[PDB]
Design a protein around this nucleic acid. Structure first.
Ligand SMILES: [Ca+2]
Lengths: 67, 66
DNA sequence: ATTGACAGCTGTCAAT
DNA sequence: ATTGACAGCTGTCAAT
């Protein structure tokens, strides 16, 4: 199988941090992310569905707010 | 988004409804059954899945009144 | 324990 | 009053 390219995942991670208080990209943002990361839309969607569960709280805890 | 025009053919839905009724105690077609139904209904797989997600909420309960 | 993925559900919008 | 669709979530599976 394999994992997603590290630069692709770097971009998604940076976006999630910057928008961590509304971690839901619009259709156009998802489209920009797809093109930037060279991933499909479905891949970008799936990453966000996983990352809102697996990365985001640890981010918002480090911040004071409680998910 | 999700801004269609029209409803699914009556014959396509009669097939889905018949299958749902016959399998009403395990209303989950296998991948092999989803493929057969799609060929029969002339719907895509995704259309079939969506019908079943809706039908299990909208049709199945009233059916299980037996 | 991490990661990518997806079947099926909830909730809702848009269309009859 | 019904329908087709779909975003995002839950739960989970296979691969790391
Ligand atoms: Ca889905």
């Amino acid at each position: 199988r394999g994992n997603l390219p590290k630069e692709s995942v770097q971009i998604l991670r940076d976006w999630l941090y910057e928008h961590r208080y509304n971690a839901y990209p619009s259709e156009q943002e998802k489209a920009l992310l797809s093109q930037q990361t060279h991933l499909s839309t479905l891949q970008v969607c799936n990453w966000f569905i996983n990352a809102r569960r697996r990365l985001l709280p640890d981010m918002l805890r480090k911040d004071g707010k409680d998910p």
